[PDB]
Amino acid sequence: CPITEMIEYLPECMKVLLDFCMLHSTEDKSCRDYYIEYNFKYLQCPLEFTKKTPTQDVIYEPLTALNAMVQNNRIELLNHPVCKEYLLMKWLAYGFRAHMMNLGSYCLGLIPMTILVVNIKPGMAFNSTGIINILDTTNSYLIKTCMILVFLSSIFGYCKEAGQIFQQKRNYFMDISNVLEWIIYTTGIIFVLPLFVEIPAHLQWQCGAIAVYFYWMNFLLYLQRFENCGIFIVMLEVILKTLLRSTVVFIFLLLAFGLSFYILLNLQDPFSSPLLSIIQTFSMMLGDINYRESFLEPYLRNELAHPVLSFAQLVSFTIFVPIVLMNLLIGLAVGDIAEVQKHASLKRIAMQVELHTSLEKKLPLWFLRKVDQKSTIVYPNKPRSGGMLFHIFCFLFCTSLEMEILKQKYRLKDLTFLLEKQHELIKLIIQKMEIISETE
Amino acid sequence: NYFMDISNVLEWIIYTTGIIFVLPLFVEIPAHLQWQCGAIAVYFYWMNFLLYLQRFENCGIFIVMLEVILKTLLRSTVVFIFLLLAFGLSFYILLNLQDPFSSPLLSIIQTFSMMLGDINYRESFLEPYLRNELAHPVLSFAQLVSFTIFVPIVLMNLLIGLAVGDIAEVQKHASLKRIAMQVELHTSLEKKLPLWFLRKVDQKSTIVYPNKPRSGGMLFHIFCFLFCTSLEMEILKQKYRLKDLTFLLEKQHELIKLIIQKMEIISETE
Numbered sequence: 001c002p003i004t005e006m007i008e009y010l011p012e013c014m015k016v017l018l019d020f021c022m023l024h025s026t027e028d029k030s031c032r033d034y035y036i037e038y039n040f041k042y043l044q045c046p047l048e049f050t051k052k053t054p055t056q057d058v059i060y061e062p063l064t065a066l067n068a069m070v071q072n073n074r075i076e077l078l079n080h081p082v083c084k085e086y087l088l089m090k091w092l093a094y095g096f097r098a099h100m101m102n103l104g105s106y107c108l109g110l111i112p113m114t115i116l117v118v119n120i121k122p123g124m125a126f127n128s129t130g131i132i133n134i135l136d137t138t139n140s141y142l143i144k145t146c147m148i149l150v151f152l153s154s155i156f157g158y159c160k161e162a163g164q165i166f167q168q169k170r171n172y173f174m175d176i177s178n179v180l181e182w183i184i185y186t187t188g189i190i191f192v193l194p195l196f197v198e199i200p201a202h203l204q205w206q207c208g209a210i211a212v213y214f215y216w217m218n219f220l221l222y223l224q225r226f227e228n229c230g231i232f233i234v235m236l237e238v239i240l241k242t243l244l245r246s247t248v249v250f251i252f253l254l255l256a257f258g259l260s261f262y263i264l265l266n267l268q269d270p271f272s273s274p275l276l277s278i279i280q281t282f283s284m285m286l287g288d289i290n291y292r293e294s295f296l297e298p299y300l301r302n303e304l305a306h307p308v309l310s311f312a313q314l315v316s317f318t319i320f321v322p323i324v325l326m327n328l329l330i331g332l333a334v335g336d337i338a339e340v341q342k343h344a345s346l347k348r349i350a351m352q353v354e355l356h357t358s359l360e361k362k363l364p365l366w367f368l369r370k371v372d373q374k375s376t377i378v379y380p381n382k383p384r385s386g387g388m389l390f391h392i393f394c395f396l397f398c399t400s401l402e403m404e405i406l407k408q409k410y411r412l413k414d415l416t417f418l419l420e421k422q423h424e425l426i427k428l429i430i431q432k433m434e435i436i437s438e439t440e
Numbered sequence: 441n442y443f444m445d446i447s448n449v450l451e452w453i454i455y456t457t458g459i460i461f462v463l464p465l466f467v468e469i470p471a472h473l474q475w476q477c478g479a480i481a482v483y484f485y486w487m488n489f490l491l492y493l494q495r496f497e498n499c500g501i502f503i504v505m506l507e508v509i510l511k512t513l514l515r516s517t518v519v520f521i522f523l524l525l526a527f528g529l530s531f532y533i534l535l536n537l538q539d540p541f542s543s544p545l546l547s548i549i550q551t552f553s554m555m556l557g558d559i560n561y562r563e564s565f566l567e568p569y570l571r572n573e574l575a576h577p578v579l580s581f582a583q584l585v586s587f588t589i590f591v592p593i594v595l596m597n598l599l600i601g602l603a604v605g606d607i608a609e610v611q612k613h614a615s616l617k618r619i620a621m622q623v624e625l626h627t628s629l630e631k632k633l634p635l636w637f638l639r640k641v642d643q644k645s646t647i648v649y650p651n652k653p654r655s656g657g658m659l660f661h662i663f664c665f666l667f668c669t670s671l672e673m674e675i676l677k678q679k680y681r682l683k684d685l686t687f688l689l690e691k692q693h694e695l696i697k698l699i700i701q702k703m704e705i706i707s708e709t710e
């Protein structure tokens with residue numbers, strides 16, 4: 001495709017082609033009612049090609065030029081103002097409403113559980129009428145509505161997850177967000193069920209704890225779609241996967257030190273069991289060694305069996321785990337964060353264009369014809385609509401030697417070709433030249 | 441233009457609060473309000489006084505690195521809010537019978553204090569377990585190991601990696617930024633002074649004696665000691681020379697074709 005070939009091969013001509021799409025009104029009247037017009041005729045195919053996979057029978061994607069510019073890493077073209085206004089129009093068309101609906105359903109699930117936790121003392125069995133101790137009134141109207149909201153949100157989450165099962169067709173097995181949602185909705189069901197079926201308070205609060213943990217832990221995954229927080233979520237992902245790869249070294253090293261301290265320091269209560277000794281060394285990992293309480297004061301009271309071996313184990317633990325292993329994790333984290341911030345400005349716009357090109361494949365085509373626009377008119381003097389809340393929302397959440405030497409090499413190759421032709425002409429001159437009075 | 445400016449806000453807080461700390465010479469004020477204002481004022485005076493070190497040449501680089509790290513820490517705050525609220529409400533449900541986790545707000549403040557690594561394992565987890573005072577002990581220890589992995593290991597190393605990257609980015613351009621701040625200071629200050637003072641104070645030439653020290657050797661010298669102190673262009677020149685070379689070679693090729701066009705061929709034809 002010639003536009004995609006221009007993006008692949010000569011992007012500095014695609015820049016000029018996009019410069020013809022930008023229009024202006026008057027250079028002197030730039031403050032008084034001034035406008036600029038953006039035309040998006042070269043950035044996408046017509047809509048009747050894109051969603052017509054059976055009947056047009058040609059491969060198409062929505063946002064053709066943007067996907068071609070992302071696959072070829074042409075970031076100076078993604079930062080062109082025509083492309084910026086194209087994504088901004090595409091977000092104001094259907095991306096904002098779809099994302100706020102997707103966030104609003106989950107937040108409707110999220111808020112009543114936190115209200116219900118911070119308004120009820122844990123450990124006590126509570127029911128639609130109140131809290132069983134006698135019954136506690138004066139909050140039952142709030143408690144009943146919050147339990148109904150959590151119950152309805154959990155069953156609609158089941159229906160949405162079953163729809164994603166019967167649509168995704170077994171690609172959803174190795175996916176973390178599905179597993180987190182299964183845990184959230186099952187556990188939030190069990191926390192609320194005493195309005196139907198009586199449950200002991202121990203099981204009820206044991207489920208409430210897990211649910212209130214995983215709701216807010218899952219709610220970090222919805223910050224990845226925004227432009228400010230997605231880079232923190234992807235750096236946290238990279239550091240956490242790097243920490244997962246290194247876990248067997250933790251297991252072996254920690255099990256060595258834990259069983260050694262279990263044999264050495266057996267008479268003390270933190271090292272009574274082997275499992276408690278393992279958990280204690282895991283807590284000592286950061287540097288909370290407890291030298292005076294566990295090593296010195298038993299030594300001065302003659303309560304250490306094997307004291308020399310115990311202090312040698314202490315200095316060996318202090319050298320290996322809090323010095324060496326923690327600095328290893330710090331060096332790995334510094335390297336990974338530098339690697340991620342090397343490619344941040346491309347990754348942001350790539351996530352946005354992937355979000356829109358994934359969302360557009362599911363919407364119906366009449367809605368696409370209704371909502372899209374071919375041109376946008378921008379007034380720099382006039383602010384955008386919805387100045388009260390939407391402006392604060394957009395402030396808070398939204399925002400070369402190689403090619404030179406390659407051109408050098410092309411010019412030098414043209415130079416040596418011309419010089420070869422010229423050398424052939426000079427040999428032809430000497431072949432046809434007339435030599436009189438210079439022979440012999 | 442002064443609305444989105446931090447130094448104006450700090451000065452409003454400083455001067456209002458220092459007024460209220462002193463007003464018992466005019467109007468009698470209870471001692472509680474007076475010392476409540478004195479605390480805020482003595483905090484913000486010395487906290488504001490860092491902003492005046494930015495004009496000097498030695499300390500301005502530390503003030504701008506501290507600015508960069510602090511803005512980077514401000515951008516990441518919603519991750520702190522969500523993660524800390526998750527762990528705080530989880531510990532509030534789990535460890536409810538203990539005094540640091542009696543309220544949800546106290547539980548949130550306690551997890552914020554546990555952030556750095558002051559976990560209090562023996563006092564809050566072990567010794568209640570040995571006295572059978574933990575409800576849900578397995579879930580409690582699982583929450584403990586999950587908290588130890590997420591917040592002091594992962595999140596703190598993330599902040600360290602971001603700080604290392606930002607400080608490297610700032611020290612990449614330090615020597616230009618120092619002189620740029622000095623020349624911006626002088627070119628901003630000169631627009632407000634009157635013109636007769638400018639004609640009075642400026643000089644066209646300066647004479648420097650390397651053998652003779654500058655005037656005010658006692659205090660001003662110690663003050664000036666304490667507070668004051670390429671491949672791309674080469675390949676571009678390469679490209680210009682090569683372009684001139686190919687232009688000359690084209691002219692020469694045209695001359696050689698003209699030679700063959702006008703040449704006289706006798707006894708070499710056919």
Ligand SMILES: CCCCCCCC/C=C\CCCCCCCC(=O)O[C@H](COC(=O)CCCCCCCCCCCCCCC)COP(=O)([O-])OCC[N+](C)(C)C
Pocket residue numbers: 174175176177210217220221224233234236237240241243244247250278282579582583585586589
């Ligand atoms: C003695 C003991 C020693 C042990 C040492 C062990 C050391 C080992 C340590 C850690 C290994 C375990 C880490 C688990 C998840 C890592 C993978 C992951 O999320 O990356 C990716 C996202 O990453 C993110 O950005 C998400 C980050 C937040 C998720 C938090 C949930 C975890 C809660 C669990 C707590 C359970 C505790 C319960 C207790 C009650 C997801 O993977 P992906 O498919 O690439 O991306 C798809 C993303 N979309 C498209 C779906 C959006």
Ligand SMILES: CCCCCCCC/C=C\CCCCCCCC(=O)O[C@H](COC(=O)CCCCCCCCCCCCCCC)COP(=O)([O-])OCC[N+](C)(C)C
Pocket residue numbers: 444445446447480487490491494503504506507510511513514517520548552
């Ligand atoms: C559970 C809780 C969890 C919460 C997590 C929260 C995590 C979030 C953390 C932090 C976010 C808040 C940071 C506030 C300021 C950051 C912006 C800033 O100063 O940068 C710039 C300078 O930067 C500097 O170099 C100045 C540095 C010193 C200023 C210190 C004053 C702060 C005192 C507040 C303490 C209040 C406490 C009161 C209590 C009594 C100023 O901005 P600028 O316009 O670019 O430059 C103009 C500079 N000139 C020209 C004016 C000179």
Ligand SMILES: *C(=S)NCc1ccccc1
Pocket residue numbers: 001002003004041042043044045064065
């Ligand atoms: C191939 S013909 N390029 C795609 C395209 C995009 C916009 C307008 C025309 C063509």
